[PDB]
């Protein structure tokens, strides 16, 4: 591989045809940071014999990804279901469901799913659900409880799986939690011996419990799921595929929530005058809508890749002309730029609980970078035509779960001076990001 006239940087790395591969996936902001530093705002790697540009000019996103003619999705989606979830599905139509998760998850339905998740909340939040039956405290990691309450509201919201008793529940999320923390190891091929077997353990009991088969449930092909489930139906999808779809599907809507959720309380409970100013909101939420896109700021991470179906010109914002190239890899990292960008934000990786409110508690929504307007400051929910369906819901989720603990309980750190953990790398590319290990609190009813 040699560059042609306006191809961006070209960085091979040393090993032969496996080039960054390794780098790359171990920790995917750290890599394509250092490749930021060295090359600038776009730059083409190799890994595993592909070559990947990379993009990191935040004013180009939204043009570039519109060009759906010249850069696929659909193909690398593919990969991903199968590496990660063995899904293959045959003839399906992948529009008509994204519209579908669009229209299900605002508006009406949304007011619907949002009063249903507030009732399950309640039910997973009672005395005996929070484990207060023993005593007056009761010691968690804040991850670990934000994960398992809102996954399980979550699940009970949009599977509408009452079926599963409190302790099937707890089951169930544990298995998820055991399947989703190899997940990026799966997608990458990254996986030793005993992690796939785990891996493979743990989807195989997900398969089965997600879809209660030994149950008489009349489908409600309304629903989105049951819609979902009625389209792969009629594309001809035999029942094990059907079954196998549904961890997918259980991924797409609770990989995020929980852990958002988990960083915001970790913030919160680590940042005193960013807890007042809350709780005193608590006692139209301005402030908690800084910290929640604070947060979002800081741990929504996801990857956003394209095939490069035929040669494509792009100029970045300087007016430079850059050429992709046909058969490569095309790679977006809004946490990069503008999310963690210093000349955007300045301590980019620094929580400022009012970063995005004026000086009258008004919305901040003036962001420079050299001089020049930046349209979207934060890009947690993707880019502009490619965004999350559920971020209505999983704001509304995170705030339920962030209202109940801060009015219903006490929670304190187990050690007064803790600050948040960091974050586990093999996280970069999936989602929001994850801890390293958990931030030990204690509980009790208010
Ligand atoms: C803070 C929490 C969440 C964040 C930051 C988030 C973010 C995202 C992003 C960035 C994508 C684009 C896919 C990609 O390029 O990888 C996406 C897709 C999607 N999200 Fe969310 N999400 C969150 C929670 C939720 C919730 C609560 C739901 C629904 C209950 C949901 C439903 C979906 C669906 C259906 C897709 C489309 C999947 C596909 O077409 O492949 N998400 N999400």
């Given at each position: 591989r040699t560059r042609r006239r306006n191809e961006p940087p070209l960085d091979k790395g040393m090993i032969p045809w496996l080039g960054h591969a390794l780098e790359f996936g171990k920790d995917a902001a750290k890599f394509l940071t250092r490749?930021?530093?060295?090359?600038?705002?776009?730059?083409?790697?190799?890994?595993?014999?592909?070559?990947?540009?990379?993009?990191?000019?935040?004013?180009?996103?939204?043009?570039?990804?519109?060009?759906?003619?010249?850069?696929?999705?659909?193909?690398?989606?593919?990969?991903?279901?199968?590496?990660?979830?063995?899904?293959?599905?045959?003839?399906?139509?992948?529009?008509?469901?994204?519209?579908?998760?669009?229209?299900?998850?605002?508006?009406?339905?949304?007011?619907?799913?949002?009063?249903?998740?507030?009732?399950?909340?309640?039910?997973?939040?009672?005395?005996?659900?929070?484990?207060?039956?023993?005593?007056?405290?009761?010691?968690?990691?804040?991850?670990?409880?934000?994960?398992?309450?809102?996954?399980?509201?979550?699940?009970?919201?949009?599977?509408?799986?009452?079926?599963?008793?409190?302790?099937?529940?707890?089951?169930?999320?544990?298995?998820?939690?055991?399947?989703?923390?190899?997940?990026?190891?799966?997608?990458?091929?990254?996986?030793?011996?005993?992690?796939?077997?785990?891996?493979?353990?743990?989807?195989?009991?997900?398969?089965?419990?997600?879809?209660?088969?030994?149950?008489?449930?009349?489908?409600?092909?309304?629903?989105?799921?049951?819609?979902?489930?009625?389209?792969?139906?009629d594309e001809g999808i035999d029942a094990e595929m059907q079954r196998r779809a549904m961890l997918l599907q259980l991924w797409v809507t609770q990989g995020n929530a929980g852990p958002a959720a988990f960083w915001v309380m970790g913030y919160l409970l680590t940042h005193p005058e960013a807890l007042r100013a809350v709780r005193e909101e608590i006692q139209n939420t301005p402030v908690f809508d800084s910290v929640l896109w604070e947060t979002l700021r800081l741990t929504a991470a996801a990857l956003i890749t394209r095939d490069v179906t035929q040669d494509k010109k792009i100029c970045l914002s300087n007016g430079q002309e850059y050429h992709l190239r046909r058969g490569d890899r095309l790679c977006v990292f809004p946490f990069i730029s503008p999310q963690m960008d210093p000349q955007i934000h300045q301590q980019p990786e620094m929580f400022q609980f009012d970063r995005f409110l004026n000086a009258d508690r008004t919305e901040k929504k003036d962001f420079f970078k050299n001089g020049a307007r930046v349209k979207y400051p934060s890009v947690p929910w993707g880019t502009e035509d490619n965004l999350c369906p559920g971020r209505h819901f999983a704001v509304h989720a995170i705030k339920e779960l962030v209202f109940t603990i801060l009015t219903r309980f006490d929670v304190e750190l187990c050690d007064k001076n803790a600050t948040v953990p960091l974050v586990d790398p093999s996280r970069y590319g999936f989602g929001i990001l994850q801890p390293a290990g958990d931030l030990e609190i204690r509980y009790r009813i208010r």
């Amino acid at each position: 591989r040699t560059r042609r006239r306006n191809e961006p940087p070209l960085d091979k790395g040393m090993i032969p045809w496996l080039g960054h591969a390794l780098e790359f996936g171990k920790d995917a902001a750290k890599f394509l940071t250092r490749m930021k530093e060295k090359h600038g705002d776009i730059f083409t790697v190799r890994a595993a014999g592909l070559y990947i540009t990379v993009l990191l000019d935040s004013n180009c996103y939204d043009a570039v990804l519109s060009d759906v003619a010249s850069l696929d999705q659909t193909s690398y989606a593919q990969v991903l279901m199968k590496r990660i979830f063995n899904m293959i599905l045959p003839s399906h139509n992948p529009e008509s469901e994204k519209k579908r998760a669009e229209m299900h998850f605002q508006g009406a339905s949304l007011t619907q799913l949002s009063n249903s998740m507030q009732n399950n909340l309640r039910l997973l939040m009672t005395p005996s659900e929070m484990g207060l039956k023993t005593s007056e405290w009761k010691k968690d990691g804040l991850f670990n409880l934000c994960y398992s309450l809102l996954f399980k509201t979550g699940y009970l919201t949009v599977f509408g799986a009452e079926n599963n008793n409190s302790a099937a529940l707890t089951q169930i999320y544990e298995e998820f939690r055991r399947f989703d923390k190899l997940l990026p190891k799966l997608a990458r091929t990254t996986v030793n011996k005993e992690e796939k077997q785990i891996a493979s353990a743990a989807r195989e009991k997900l398969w089965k419990w997600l879809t209660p088969s030994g149950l008489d449930r009349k489908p409600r092909e309304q629903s989105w799921l049951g819609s979902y489930v009625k389209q792969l139906q009629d594309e001809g999808i035999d029942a094990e595929m059907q079954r196998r779809a549904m961890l997918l599907q259980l991924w797409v809507t609770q990989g995020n929530a929980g852990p958002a959720a988990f960083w915001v309380m970790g913030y919160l409970l680590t940042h005193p005058e960013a807890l007042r100013a809350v709780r005193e909101e608590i006692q139209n939420t301005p402030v908690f809508d800084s910290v929640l896109w604070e947060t979002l700021r800081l741990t929504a991470a996801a990857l956003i890749t394209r095939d490069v179906t035929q040669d494509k010109k792009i100029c970045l914002s300087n007016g430079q002309e850059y050429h992709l190239r046909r058969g490569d890899r095309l790679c977006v990292f809004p946490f990069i730029s503008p999310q963690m960008d210093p000349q955007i934000h300045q301590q980019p990786e620094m929580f400022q609980f009012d970063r995005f409110l004026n000086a009258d508690r008004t919305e901040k929504k003036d962001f420079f970078k050299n001089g020049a307007r930046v349209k979207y400051p934060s890009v947690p929910w993707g880019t502009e035509d490619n965004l999350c369906p559920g971020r209505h819901f999983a704001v509304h989720a995170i705030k339920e779960l962030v209202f109940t603990i801060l009015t219903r309980f006490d929670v304190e750190l187990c050690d007064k001076n803790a600050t948040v953990p960091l974050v586990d790398p093999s996280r970069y590319g999936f989602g929001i990001l994850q801890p390293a290990g958990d931030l030990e609190i204690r509980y009790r009813i208010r």
